[PDB]
Design a protein around this nucleic acid. Structure first.
Length: 915
DNA sequence: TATACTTTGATTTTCTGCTGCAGGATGAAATCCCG
DNA sequence: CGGGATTTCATCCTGCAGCATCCCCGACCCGTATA
RNA sequence: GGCGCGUUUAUUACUUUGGAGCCAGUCCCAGCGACUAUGUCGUAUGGACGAAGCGCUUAUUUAUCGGCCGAUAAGUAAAACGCAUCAAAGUCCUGCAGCAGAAAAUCAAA
C-alpha cells in the first residue's frame, strides 16, 4: 500500500477531474537508444527474448554525428555574433530582448515627474483581482516593472522579464533575405538541413540562452550597485588606522562600478589587496574581532556570456614536465653555492620555518605516517647531514634525480602501453615541486623581485600538472525537436519528427523516433485502424488541437530519416506512454517537445569515455483532479534537518496526537571519505563516483517525498512545513552541498503535487519557523539574562543552581566550569561581567540541546528527541498562526513580540486541550 | 620556564561535483516557388 | 496551380512577507608537553 | 573494493538506490616506512596480472569399479530450469554563478 502509483490512483479515483486552463504539468522521459551494447546486454541473459528488437542502423548514427556537430557549430556562431553585439552596447541588446507587452489598451500616463533609466514610464491598473499598478513602459511596449524605492524609486530601463521570442530570429540569419553576414543554415550547415525545423529550434535554443544571460545580468548589475555603495561606505578602515595611529596607509582607491568583466577582475583585485592588508595588519597584529572592523566584501555573482567566454586552457603533460625540469636544471649550480654557504643558523631557519624537517610524524598507529615529499627530502637532508655541508648537496641532488628518473621512466612505460598509472603522476609532480621549492631558496633569500615571477609560473605549472590529467572534455551535444504538429494544409509534418511504433508480431510495438531534418519530404501519412503484424508505423501527430494517430508510409533510406529505436522499462511506459488512466491517442497527455542528447555515461569496463544516446521526450498533462478535499484531522509536522531529514508528527485538529530517511548523513559521509582518500593521493578524482552522491541524494529525496505524500494522503492530512527561505544551508567549513536539501524535499513534493492536479493549498502548507525546536512541549527563549547573580542565577521560571560541566574540546580539553567561573569572576563581579565572555559557559551548560540530538528543558526537566518535539512545535505553530483565538489578535496589533504571544497561547492551550 | 610546534586567517594556481537561479517545454497562418 | 517548403506571429501568472530554522563553532588559540 | 545473476516497483530491454550471491592475492613497476641509506628489508597504497555461485539433463577425455561398453571422482561444452535472491524511485535540457572538496605556494597570529 506504500508505492507511489497507488497514491495517485487513490487521488484520481475518489473525486472528479477537470481539464487544465492554459498550460499543464510537465514530465519527461529519458529513454536510451538501442545502439549495440544494449543488445549485447540482451544476448547475455539466462532467459532470452523471442524477438531481438533493433539496432541503430550505422547510417542513422552517421547523420546524427553530422546533425549534432553542425548544430553545436551553428550555436557557437550565433552566440559569438551576439557576444560581439553585447560588448559594443549593453543597453542596445538589452532593449532588443525586452518583450512585446500583450494585446492591451489605452493605458494611463506618467510622463511628468517620471522619465526612465535609459523613456516614458507609463502605467496601467491591469489585474483588478488583488494586484494592479503594472508600469509597462513604451515610446513595442517593453514591460518595465521595477523601482524598489529604498532611497530612490527608479524603474529598470529594460523590462522585468527578458524574453525568448522577442528578437524575431527568423527574420534574421536563417531566412534567405536579410543581408546580415552571418547565416548558420547557409554558411556552416552547408545548406543541406531544412530551414524550417532546424532554424526554428536553433532560434528557440539560442534566444532562450541569451535571454537567461541578460535576465541574470540585470539583477547582478543592480546588486553590485548596492555592494559598491556599501563598500564606499566601509572605508573607515582608513579611519581606524589613524584612530589607533599604528598603521601608516593602505594606499588604494576603489574603481567605479565595473560593468564589463575585466573591470570586475580589477575591482576584486583591489578588494583582495585591501582585504589581505586588513587581515595582515588589523586582524592579527592588532587583535581586532571581525565584527568591530567590518571587512570589504567581494563582487560575486557576475555572469559571463554563455558559450563563447569559456577558458580552454588545455596543455599537454610531458611538455610541461620537461619545462619544469628545464627550469630546475637551469638553476642547479646557483643552488650549490648557496646551501654550501651562508650559516648553520640561518640555514636551519630555512630548513625549519619552510616546513622541511618532519615535525611530528612518528605516531605509529599500528609503520609511520607518510610525509608530503617536501619532508622526505628533509629526512634525506638530515641523514646526509649526520653521515656526511658542501658535498651533501651533490648526494642529495643525485638521489632525488635518480628518483625522478625512475618515476618518469615508470610513467613512460605505463602511460604509453595501455593505461594510466594515475597516482605516480601525482607523486612525480610533488617531487618536482619539492625540487623546485629547494632550488628557489637562493631567490627567496637574496632578492624577492624575480622570485615571485618564477613562483607564479611554477604555481601555474603545478596546477596544470595536477588538475589537467583529471579534467573532462567532451561536453554534451543536444538537438531539439520543437513540437509535433501537422501543418496548415493537413498533409505534412511540421518539425518532421514522430513517435512511430512499428507493430511487432503478436500485439506489441517497437516505438521508434523518426527525424527528417534534411531538406526534403520522405514521410507521408493518411489514417488507419488495422492491427496487422507488420509495419503499421502509426505515429501520433497532434492535428490542430486533437490527438490523432495515422497510417504512415516511408522506406528506410540513407539520405535522411534518422530512425532511433528507444529502450525503456515497463515502468516508464506504464507511467506515460500507455497509461491506462491518462491515455495517449485520446489527448489526456500530450507530447510537447523533445530532444536528442549525446552525453557521457559511465561504462565500467573502460573509463567514462562512453557517450550514449538519450532522447528525452517531454510531455504535458491535460487531465487534472479538481480540488474538493479538506484534510481535517491533519497537522503532519514536517521538521527538516541534516542528520535526520523529515521528522513526522501527526495530531488531531485540536492539536493532540516517524523518522523518514533515517540513515542518510552517514552514507554521504562515506562517499565523501572515499572521494577524499582518492583525492589526497592520486591528485584527482577517479571518475566512477562522479555521480554517486547526486544519485544517492536524488534517491533519498524522491523516496522521502513518496513517504511524505503517502502519510499525507492516507491519514487524511496536510503537511506543514517551515519557512526555511529557499537557498537554506549551513554554509560553513565542512559543509558539503550534498546534505543541503531543505529546499529539495519541498521542491520534489510540490512537483509531485503540481502533477496530478493539486496546488499548495490542499496538502502542503507552510508556517513560520520562529522559536520551534526551542519550546518544551510541557513548558515554555534566547534572552538568557546573566544579570542575575558568580558562585548562581535563579532565572525567571522558579529557581535554579550552579555547579556546571562544560565540555569544550577541539584539542584535548574538558571542564567543570565553576572554578574557571570564579577565576573569571575576579571579585567585584561588575568588572568581571564587563570583561568576560563567560556567559558562554552558562550558554554551553544550561542550554537546551547539549548534544546535537536531544533536548533538555529549564523548567520541566524533560528529555525529548528535539525532532519529534520540533515536529509537534511545527504542527502547533501552524495551529497558532491561522486560528484567531485571543493571542493572534496580539502580534498583529503590535502589542507583544512573537515569543510572549506564543508562550501565552501555548501554556494556555497546554492546560486546556494539551496543544 | 619559554621556545618549539599547531591550527588557522588572508591572497593565488588547477581540477572536480552539487545546488540555485534564469530561459523553456511552437501551433497557426500566410506567402511563395515550381515543375 | 496544388504541393511542399519557407516565413511570420504571438500567448498568460499576482503576493503579500519578519529573526531563526539547519549544525556547530567559538570558547582557548591558547594550551601543553618536554626537552 | 571488484565481478555477476536477476525480482517487485497496476507490451522493453533505460538511469538509479537497496537486499542477497561469489572472490579481495603476488613484490613483477611505482608509492610509503625503517635503516645496516645512490641500496636492502618490510608494508598490498596505486598500475599489471589472475580470483570471481551452486545444483539438475545431454555428448565426451582422464583415474576407480565390471566379466563392446556400463556406473562413480574431476574437467570440458551446450540449452532449458531451479535455489541462494528480494524491494523501491525517476522532470529533463541549456547556460552561468555560488558554495564545498583536494593538494600546493606566499605573508602572518598566538
Amino acid at each position: 500500500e506504500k508505492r507511489i502509483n497507488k497514491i495517485r490512483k487513490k487521488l484520481s479515483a475518489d473525486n472528479a477531474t477537470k481539464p487544465v486552463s492554459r498550460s499543464g504539468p510537465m514530465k519527461t522521459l529519458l529513454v536510451r537508444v538501442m545502439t549495440d551494447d544494449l543488445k549485447k546486454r540482451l544476448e547475455k541473459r539466462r532467459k532470452k527474448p523471442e524477438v531481438m528488437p533493433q539496432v541503430i542502423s550505422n547510417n542513422a548514427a552517421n547523420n546524427l554525428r553530422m546533425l549534432l556537430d553542425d548544430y553545436t557549430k551553428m550555436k557557437e556562431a550565433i552566440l559569438q555574433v551576439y557576444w560581439q553585439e553585447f560588448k559594443d552596447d549593453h543597453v542596445g541588446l538589452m532593449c532588443k530582448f525586452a518583450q512585446p507587452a500583450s494585446x492591451x489598451x489605452x493605458x494611463x500616463x506618467x510622463x511628468x515627474x517620471x522619465x526612465x533609466x535609459x523613456x516614458x514610464x507609463x502605467x496601467x491598473x491591469x489585474x483588478x483581482x488583488x494586484x494592479x499598478x503594472x508600469x509597462x513602459x513604451x515610446x513595442x511596449x517593453x514591460x518595465x516593472x521595477x523601482x524598489x524605492x529604498x532611497x530612490x524609486x527608479x524603474x529598470x530601463x529594460x523590462x522585468g522579464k527578458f524574453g525568448q521570442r522577442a528578437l524575431d530570429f527568423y527574420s534574421i540569419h536563417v531566412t534567405k533575405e536579410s543581408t546580415h553576414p552571418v547565416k548558420p543554415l547557409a554558411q556552416i550547415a552547408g545548406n543541406r538541413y531544412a530551414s524550417g525545423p532546424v532554424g526554428k529550434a536553433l532560434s528557440d535554443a539560442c534566444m532562450g540562452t541569451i535571454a537567461s544571460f541578460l535576465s541574470k545580468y540585470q539583477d547582478i548589475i543592480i546588486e553590485h550597485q548596492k555592494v559598491v555603495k556599501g563598500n564606499q561606505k566601509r572605508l573607515e578602515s582608513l579611519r581606524e588606522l589613524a584612530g589607533k595611529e599604528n598603521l601608516e596607509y593602505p594606499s588604494v582607491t576603489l574603481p567605479p562600478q565595473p560593468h564589463t568583466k575585466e573591470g570586475v577582475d580589477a575591482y576584486n583585485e583591489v578588494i583582495a589587496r585591501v582585504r589581505m592588508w586588513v587581515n595582515l595588519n588589523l586582524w592579527q597584529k592588532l587583535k581586532l574581532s571581525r565584527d568591530d572592523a567590518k571587512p570589504l566584501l567581494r563582487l560575486k555573482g557576475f555572469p559571463s556570456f554563455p558559450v563563447v567566454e569559456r577558458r580552454e586552457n588545455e596543455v599537454d603533460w610531458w611538455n610541461t614536465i620537461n619545462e619544469v625540469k628545464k627550469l630546475i636544471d637551469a638553476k642547479r649550480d646557483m643552488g650549490r653555492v648557496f646551501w654550501s654557504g651562508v650559516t648553520a643558523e640561518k640555514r636551519n631557519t630555512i630548513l625549519e620555518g619552510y616546513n622541511y624537517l618532519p615535525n611530528e610524524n612518528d605516531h605509529k598507529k599500528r609503520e609511520n605516517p607518510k610525509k608530503p615529499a617536501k619532508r622526505q627530502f628533509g629526512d634525506l637532508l638530515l641523514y646526509l647531514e649526520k653521515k656526511y655541508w658542501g658535498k651533501v648537496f651533490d648526494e642529495a641532488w643525485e638521489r632525488i634525480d635518480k628518483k625522478i628518473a625512475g618515476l618518469t621512466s615508470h610513467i613512460e612505460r605505463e602511460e604509453a602501453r595501455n593505461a594510466e598509472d594515475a597516482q605516480s603522476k601525482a607523486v612525480l609532480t610533488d617531487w618536482l615541486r619539492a625540487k623546485a621549492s629547494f632550488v628557489l631558496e637562493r631567490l627567496k633569500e637574496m632578492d624577492e623581485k624575480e622570485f615571485y615571477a618564477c613562483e607564479i609560473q611554477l604555481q601555474k605549472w603545478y596546477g596544470d600538472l595536477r588538475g589537467n590529467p583529471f579534467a573532462v572534455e567532451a561536453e554534451n551535444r543536444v538537438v531539439d525537436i520543437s513540437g509535433f504538429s501537422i501543418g496548415s494544409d493537413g498533409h505534412s509534418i511540421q518539425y518532421r519528427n514522430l513517435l512511430a511504433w512499428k507493430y511487432l508480431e503478436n500485439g506489441k510495438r517497437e516505438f521508434y523516433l523518426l527525424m527528417n531534418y534534411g531538406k526534403k519530404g520522405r514521410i507521408r501519412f493518411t489514417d488507419g485502424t488495422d492491427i496487422k503484424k507488420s509495419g503499421k508505423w502509426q505515429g501520433l501527430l497532434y492535428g490542430g488541437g486533437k490527438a490523432k494517430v495515422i497510417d504512415l508510409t516511408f522506406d528506410p533510406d540513407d539520405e535522411q530519416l534518422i530512425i532511433l529505436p528507444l529502450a525503456f522499462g515497463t515502468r516508464q511506459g506504464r507511467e506515460f506512454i500507455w497509461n491506462d488512466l491518462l491515455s495517449l491517442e485520446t489527448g489526456l497527455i500530450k507530447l510537447a517537445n523533445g530532444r536528442v542528447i549525446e552525453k557521457t555515461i559511465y561504462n565500467k569496463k573502460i573509463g567514462r569515455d562512453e557517450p550514449a544516446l538519450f532522447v528525452a521526450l517531454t510531455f504535458e498533462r491535460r487531465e487534472v483532479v479538481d480540488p474538493s478535499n479538506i484534510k481535517p484531522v491533519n497537522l503532519i509536522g514536517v521538521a527538516r534537518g541534516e542528520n535526520i531529514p523529515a521528522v513526522i508528527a501527526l495530531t488531531d485538529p485540536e492539536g493532540c496526537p516517524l523518522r523518514i530517511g533515517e540513515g542518510y548523513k552517514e552514507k554521504q559521509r562515506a562517499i565523501q571519505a572515499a572521494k577524499e582518500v582518492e583525492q589526497r593521493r592520486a591528485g584527482g578524482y577517479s571518475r566512477k563516483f562522479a555521480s554517486k552522491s547526486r544519485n544517492l541524494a536524488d534517491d533519498m529525496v524522491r523516496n522521502s517525498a513518496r513517504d511524505l505524500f503517502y502519510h499525507a494522503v492516507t491519514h487524511d492530512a496536510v503537511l506543514v512545513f517551515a519557512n526555511l527561505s529557499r537557498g537554506f544551508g549551513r554554509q560553513g567549513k565542512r559543509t558539503f552541498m550534498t546534505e543541503r536539501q531543505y529546499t529539495k524535499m519541498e521542491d520534489w513534493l510540490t512537483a509531485k503535487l503540481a502533477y496530478e492536479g493539486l496546488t499548495s493549498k490542499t496538502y502542503l502548507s507552510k508556517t513560520l519557523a520562529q522559536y520551534t525546536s526551542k519550546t518544551c512541549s510541557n513548558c515554555g527563549x534566547x534572552x538568557x539574562x546573566x544579570x542575575x547573580x558568580x558562585x548562581x542565577x535563579x532565572x525567571x521560571x522558579x529557581x535554579x543552581x550552579x555547579x556546571x560541566x562544560x565540555x569544550x574540546x577541539x584539542x584535548x580539553x574538558x571542564x567543570x566550569x565553576x572554578x574557571x567561573x570564579x577565576x573569571x569572576x575576579x571579585x567585584x563581579x561588575x568588572x568581571x561581567x564587563x570583561x568576560x565572555x563567560x556567559x558562554x559557559x552558562x550558554x554551553x551548560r544550561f542550554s537546551h540541546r547539549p548534544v546535537q540530538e536531544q533536548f533538555v528543558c529549564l523548567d520541566c526537566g524533560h528529555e525529548v528527541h528535539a525532532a519529534e518535539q520540533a515536529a509537534l512545535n511545527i504542527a502547533r505553530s501552524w495551529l497558532f498562526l491561522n486560528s484567531n483565538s485571543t493571542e493572534f489578535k496580539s502580534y498583529k496589533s503590535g502589542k507583544q513580540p512573537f515569543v510572549g504571544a506564543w508562550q501565552a497561547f501555548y501554556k494556555r492551550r497546554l492546560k486546556e486541550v494539551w496543544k
